[PDB]
Design a protein around this ligand. Structure first.
Ligand SMILES: Cc1ncc(COP(=O)(O)O)c(CN)c1O
Ligand SMILES: Cc1ncc(COP(=O)(O)O)c(CN)c1O
Ligand SMILES: [Mg+2]
Lengths: 414, 411
């Protein structure tokens, strides 16, 4: 609309490319809005005041609803006291106690801003702890956008990641072999708790893979690092490997544990405490109290309320509804990963032209779904939201069938 | 006091060493409180409700006073709309226009969280722009706590910084020599706008040094990056090298441009725009609107009010007062760098025993000063605050003289 077009014209002049990073719409159909005006519960409004039921949950942070009144009350109370001060607030202690108490593997916490801050801290910690160099990551796994791990390597030197080595996710043989390929020199294994990457089907972690990670780390003294920045608190009320009976040495957390306030965390066992004290990591904003107050109230709600069961039920209902609509319209889906963090692709759609068209058509019905990145459910998504969503998705399936002969892949994608 | 001691005991159990990073009190005298309860204007209150006139300004962020009412009203207005959303707020555009408008060398802005995010982005951008490897930094200059730049190297590999090379700050010949030592391979020169580092006297940047940096960059196509995360908006209303007449290609900003709200920025000229589009930098929280709304209002106040002149006047008064006071007591100071971001050391105090004792004695008088790290003035510090500060500093000078024979360095 008129406001979006003005904003895009202006943005291109003063922001490289008009926008950047994971929230850029550059690889989405052109009808996706870039700039928003407001948000509440499970909904966002674009600059032209069109509402969307939001299945990105702000790319993860919106766990409980935008402007959730209890979290905003806790943030308000802390803001009357102080935020970014010469030292941390006393409540930093309360937050570390609360987080450590919830995470069975952890005896301590460190707070930072970005999830990338937490994964980088984990990497440096493991090198200090072991005196070894090699960090093992799954090929194509996203752990942040630092030089060591950013997925797109313009301006990145080989030397920035020369001591990162790779294994195939969910392949126990591949991981075992990676330990032996750098025999005696493994500082850490990083693993996301499931496979959650762009343009790729999701897949749950396999027990044998997770056991092999834990066993090889135990045998060698390497630290097991679960990167829970994305899945944290939508799989479980603890580390997302809890249900596999596999406890890491370090876990990284972010996005949603203050329901949108900027704070991330490294949780660590006592095994790793000395190395955590030896490294030097910090930032201007890492000791700010208002995000910590929001985190304390979010963690309370996580502990004390059926938020998790609620958002999973909404996810499951959406999944079932799309399966049924899929069969009716003759357009097979691949719905993968947990229903509460779903990847929803079309079968037999290798250039994504079908998925792109369908996602764009859902916008016209007031639904924001994503053709290449996993989605997310919030505890604020209602049974009514899901019913209304499925009316939009029905029409989107019809629009894709109607326009099927004229569909084109995204040019920049191509 | 009692609450501080309970908190340190509890902290030790659930946080490595009870605290970490630049706000840890580990290297300060033991009477420095680690944990605080509240903050307002130029004052902080510790966990035992003792007020201090605060000369750290939260280590830079507090430019206009804690809980500054206009910035909080602007933050409130945005919070009723939305903060961390599926895309940025429309106000991201307003913020970029405002920041670009204020910064003469800049045509575009990118926003992030940490100052370290901005400096890292500048590094990657320069390598993408030039296709070269070597980043030149001043020996001992702090640009963040990433693997490539962190000052303490536990867990850091040689390979993390093998393409960072060093020059001597304020030494034009050293910088020129460093270009030639990596001939045709310089991606960027990073410089803080003055020397501002721990345990060291500060020094203003020399014109010939800055001109050399600009000229060597111009000749080689390397990018000149001014790291203004610390000094930004306390030296000038533009890049802190504005008074030298030297414009960088990139400048890095953070700490105070949203008066405590967490947001940082890379500002760049069109020369660097293509490379800025080519690199991939992002974060979950980098597109949040409320820090951007605080930033817009902070930047307006910076442009439209005499905040700079106010904090400079306060810094100048404090410096002249301490000069006179120290001389009366026969204890010479080294007050270095800008008066509004002062380093206050004692002459002939190589193990900091005197400065530590003095700084500790200031706490008893309700004044928070730092014996090894530069301090900061805010526009909320008043003439009466300086007068009251000087009463406490006087007593601290007397305390140091009384206990002089017994002073011991920090363990
Ligand atoms: C000049 C300079 N540059 C970069 C940084 C990094 O900022 P942050 O701590 O917010 O990551 C700092 C922080 N002291 C700084 O002083
Ligand atoms: C699993 C995972 N780890 C780390 C990060 C990095 O977090 P941030 O973008 O907040 O720096 C992300 C962000 N997508 C993530 O999904
Ligand atoms: Mg625990």
């Amino acid at each position: 609309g008129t406001r979006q077009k003005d904003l895009r014209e202006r943005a291109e002049r003063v922001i490289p490319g008009g926008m950047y990073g994971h929230e850029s719409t550059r690889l989405l159909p052109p009808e996706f809005p870039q700039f928003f005006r407001r948000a509440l519960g499970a909904r966002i409004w674009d600059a032209d005041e069109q509402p969307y039921i939001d299945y990105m949950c702000a790319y993860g942070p919106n766990l409980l609803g935008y402007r959730q009144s209890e979290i905003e009350a806790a943030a308000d109370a802390q803001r009357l006291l102080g935020d970014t001060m010469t030292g941390p607030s006393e409540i930093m202690v309360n937050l570390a106690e609360a987080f450590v108490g919830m995470v069975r593997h952890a005896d301590w916490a460190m707070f930072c801003k970005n999830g990338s801050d937490a994964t980088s801290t984990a990497m440096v910690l493991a090198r200090a702890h072991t005196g070894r160099k090699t960090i093992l990551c799954a090929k194509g796994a996203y752990h942040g956008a630092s030089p060591w791990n950013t997925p797109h390597t313009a301006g990145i030197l080989a030397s920035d990641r020369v001591h990162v080595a790779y294994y195939t996710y969910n392949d126990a043989q591949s991981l075992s072999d990676a330990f032996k390929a750098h025999d005696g020199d493994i500082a850490a294994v990083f693993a996301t708790p499931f496979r959650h990457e762009v343009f790729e089907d999701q897949a749950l972690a396999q027990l044998e893979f997770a056991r092999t990670a834990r066993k090889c780390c135990d045998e060698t003294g390497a630290l097991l690092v679960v990167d829970d920045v994305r899945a944290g608190f939508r799989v479980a009320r603890d580390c997302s490997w809890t249900h596999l009976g596999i406890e890491p040495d370090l876990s990284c957390w972010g996005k949603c544990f203050a329901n949108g306030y900027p704070i991330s965390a490294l949780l660590g066992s006592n095994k790793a405490r000395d190395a955590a004290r030896d490294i030097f990591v910090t930032g201007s904003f890492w000791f700010s109290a208002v995000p910590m107050a929001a985190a304390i109230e979010t963690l309370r709600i996580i502990r004390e309320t059926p938020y998790l069961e609620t958002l999973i039920a909404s996810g499951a209902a959406l999944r079932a509804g799309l399966e049924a609509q899929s069969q009716r319209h003759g357009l097979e889906l691949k719905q993968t990963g947990p229903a509460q963090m779903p990847q929803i692709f079309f079968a037999d759609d290798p250039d994504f032209r079908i998925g792109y068209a369908w996602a764009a058509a859902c916008l016209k019905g007031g639904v924001y779904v994503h053709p290449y990145h996993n989605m997310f459910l919030s505890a604020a998504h209602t049974v009514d939201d899901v019913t209304e969503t499925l009316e939009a998705t029905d029409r989107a399936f019809s629009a894709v069938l109607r326009d099927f002969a004229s569909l084109q892949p995204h040019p920049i994608l191509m």
